[PDB]
UniProtKB/Swiss-Prot annotation, chains A, B, C, D:
This is Superoxide dismutase [Mn], mitochondrial. Binds 1 Mn(2+) ion per subunit. Belongs to the iron/manganese superoxide dismutase family. Its cofactor is Mn(2+).
Length: 199, 199, 199, 199
């Protein structure tokens, strides 16, 4: 078992004009590719350190493991959260949960937007599921810190607000990017992730 | 006393082909402008909270104050650290200190490059002066955390490795950007900052 | 304003046998007193730095302001959260909220105990109110980071798990302290704080 | 490997009056023992997660691995840094290094004391060796974050300023503990660690 770069499930230009082909190609073929390759490198070092009982060396590898590991986890989810067939609103039980937990779909969108706009530096906004409480929850994460690994929330929808996710097209104006991304959210996927949490 | 956006001391295209005019214009007129304006906003809120003794409100403002305050501090130094008249090596006492503390100028460049390349997410690489020890020191800082405010080191040379500093021109390849930036380092300015530390 | 050490609402021995008199006296008269005194020193330094527009100094003072400010906020709440007349369960709307959000009072105790036991190093366990979601929420905070200032949750009940809160009596056995403190929870105060969050 | 609690190099009462026997016994047999036991549990969980390629689980275990792993690393060094035959000043090349890098032995003590007193919450003060710069360096570390694993500096002398290291004897008065511990520093061990850093 090595970790592998998943293929993007649509063409690089499939999200235009919301997210351009240049961004999608760099983001997938350069950024994600680097995280998974560097993850495998870090994991092999960690296995060596673990088998030798070298605790210092394990601890020294944690930043790279969290960063590259998180990068792989986060982007793998992100690509499935987007789709040319996306946008609009979810339906069914997910929609019911959104209304119940956030008041309305628009109030939810404002809350996830606010979380995403509010990241200072690099990071992600998330809609997650709190297994303990049995309800939806919004959280922000710095850098590539992954949601489940660092908070326990099960990821449903992630919004990447690293500058590489938007800068070529939207420059400094992160809010223009967050307005555009709502048009390509794959609610079919977010719904599947939500229904997998409930039983 | 309000904080103010300092004018850039050369034309937006003065650093071409090392850093392009589009980057310089966005970086100064959008990014820095936002930090100083948001700094002034945060500072006024903080003065209000301070005068009321509202400790909760002071603490809630710290992230914005450090981020925008640091953004203003960092970029103000950064613009003076670059120049169309830059590149090459420093001379005099700065050069002597570099050789003494790092072995050689090239060994120093490798160490500051390594610090800058090593930032995971957004941040800065710094050459600083340790007043206590009386010598040079390299450090990295996350996001806009400023060097003197968070470590006590006096900043001499800063390298911005936020994606907005390089992405339009160099895309994901941060090492191409760090190779290019050596050509525009204003050693006259770094020398002035160094001599101001010594007495 | 010039912050002051609040009077303890009861005798130093009033929470025996659950928290001994030596601990209460130290905790109030030395620890909380130090936070107040250092908060006042830091706030005066911040006033000087604001007047000069010294952003570096403002940032350098943040750790002392969060630590000592947070220490004052947290302990001022903590004293009111305990009582010689405390223990048992709350009643009315707070108990209804606890049952709705955590399943039962005993499951709530389990979760707040677990958050408090889980703190690695110094910190606090909290029951808070989430104003946006209109429900209760458990969180943990490191060091003296205060709940409202760092998370937006309104504090209802805090459990101090700094070693100074229990060590003289319980030594390393934090879970024994956690079991004992349920006997002195002032549910009247927690109820007042909860009702204040609602209109 | 299966990590083990090392035997203490002396009797629990051998550092009296400076660190009392009750503290040493607790510190070794309960605190350090817990770090070892929890390190072993966490390392077995990491082995399971590596075998499955569960990156989320790997990341979720990082806090426990750094905390307990760091706790084992730090305390294993600390015991060897103290001795009933300790105190006074080092000699030879280590004393020459201390004088060169800090001005004098008394100025070195001032600086390491100040780093150790300055820790807000739980942590450690360290004298370390910087291999790249070929000189001594003082640093502070939060919680159980280990020196080498988090900074690259090689540990020479550690001062534990967790409340459990002093509280039963010194209560809140950390500076008194800091003054007393100079009487039991095992400069032979610190010297061995220093000579090992050089060729
Ligand atoms: K297309
Ligand atoms: K030009
Ligand atoms: Mn990304
Ligand atoms: Mn910048
Ligand atoms: Mn306390
Ligand atoms: Mn300890």
């Amino acid at each position: 078992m090595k970790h592998s770069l998943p293929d993007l499930p649509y063409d690089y230009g499939a999200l235009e004009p919301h997210i351009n082909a240049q961004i999608m190609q760099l983001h997938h073929s350069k950024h994600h590719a680097a995280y998974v390759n560097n993850l495998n490198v870090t994991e092999e070092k960690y296995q060596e350190a673990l088998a030798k009982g070298d605790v210092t060396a394990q601890i020294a590898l944690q930043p790279a493991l969290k960063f590259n590991g998180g990068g792989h986890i986060n982007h793998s989810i992100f690509w499935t959260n987007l789709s040319p067939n996306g946008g609009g609103e979810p339906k069914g039980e997910l929609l019911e949960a959104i209304k119940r937990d956030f008041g309305s779909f628009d109030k939810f969108k404002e809350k996830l937007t606010a979380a995403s706009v509010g990241v200072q530096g690099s990071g992600w906004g998330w809609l997650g599921f709190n297994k303990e409480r049995g309800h939806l929850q919004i959280a922000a994460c710095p850098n590539q810190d992954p949601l489940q690994g660092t908070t326990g929330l099960i990821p449903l929808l992630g919004i990447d607000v690293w500058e590489h996710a938007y800068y070529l097209q939207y420059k400094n104006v992160r809010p223009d990017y967050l307005k555009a991304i709502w048009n390509v959210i794959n609610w079919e996927n977010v719904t599947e992730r939500y229904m997998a949490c409930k039983k």
